[PDB]
């Protein structure tokens, strides 16, 4: 169809603008980790939870590995 | 996908470790996500947009503070998302100091 | 302007006074000129005296353009340890509270009460990773009918200027900290002459930075903060309508922000100045590491000799190999610095060069620069 590929376009655009937003705010998250986090917040989830987890998981490979 | 196994996929992207090598990291993910399982937080994305613009003025790059404004408009312009607030709150909270940002490609 | 001025005098300033009273056989002109002079001058008389516009513009320079000196040095001397720690622990009320007693301790307590109530600490925001030096500007709010003269948009540009000079005074007293380390440590380093070479190596990079910075201070002193102030003072004494005050004071602002490196084209020069701002605090870590290592052996050697009243020959082995590695580290630091400062002067090329020539003139002397040393 047309509106089914325009729906597939409307995520691909937003994932590209959020990729600019990710580097200008200087996170350690790349595009691959970003895609999981955008699926989680597509369902709806506390970002306050996700922030504390990633502050620990990133701290779980620079002093435990 | 179910969210519980999605946490373990996240743990194998962030850390190079497999999902059968450790279970403690996944257990901490279950510890925080569980008993917070449903969304209960409130969004005020207006205030957080106004707080990103003050930060981009603080870099003393003022052309890029208004380029973000037009890129922030586009997320509402498409509007296929759940909350615009959530991923932006996550991405603001994890900030490090680029000291003033010695470059930006601007797409 | 006439009807607007008399309305403004009544409604905001809260003074009720009727003072005032071929085209049409030229009927308009005489009463219009008279009314012009009388109403606008009376309005300026009540703003200059009663709401003290005169002291307020004087203290605008003193606080937002950092043109007092006493206040800032006192401020930084007491407020180093809090501000160096990140803004996640900083809380604005502590800074405001320490400031008032600090002003009473030094000489800024003989000031008029008006300027003492306008000042308060202004935070920007708390975001992780920033040092507290990054989010610190004085507010210096202003209210009244004078608020129409001094806009918020004025203060915004002032805060940017504040940020530049605030760096250029923090870093300057960090250079003074470098010099303090040199002077008050070499006076007890008269035990051993083995240090003299690498000590000279530290001293020369200190002196190289002093020649830049102390000149740069003089440049800001006499050609950014004095010429504009002279022009501003004369444009204030010349005023006979309030629009003259506004449309001259904005030129005062718009020439400070162009004499300082905050334009669209001068951003690259500021960027390279940031490298100098990096190397000065890097030299702070270079110096203390030498002292904290060198001094330790001498104390334990004194205690080893008091035991006897070949073990300390093995400390000489680590010393004799650590002096080249430390020396070469400082050498590549100096080479980095040399390349950057000569690139700074050689980047200066003609596209307006109306204040960058004037800084280079004073920075370049003995013609050691562009003689290739």
Residue numbers in the entry:
A (entry chain k): 11 to 75
B (entry chain j): 7 to 113
C (entry chain F): 485 to 505, 524 to 811, 827 to 890
Paper text:
Microtubules are formed de novo in a process termed nucleation, which is spatially and temporally highly controlled by γ-tubulin complexes, composed of γ-tubulin1 and associated γ-tubulin-complex proteins (GCP). In most eukaryotes, microtubules are templated from a preassembled γ-tubulin ring complex (γ-TuRC) that determines the position and direction of microtubule growth. Here, we used cryo-EM to identify and characterize γ-TuRC assembly intermediates after recombinant expression of the complex, which allowed us to delineate a comprehensive stepwise assembly pathway from a stable 6-spoked core to the mature 14-spoked γ-TuRC, identifying successive stabilization and conformational locking of γ-TuSC units as central principles in the assembly process.
Interestingly, during this step of complex assembly, the GRIP2 domains of the γ-TuSC(5,6) unit are repositioned by ~5 Å towards the helical axis of the γ-TuRC and become locked in their final position. Collectively, these data suggest that the recruitment and subsequent ‘conformational locking’ of individual γ-TuSC units assumes a central role during γ-TuRC assembly.
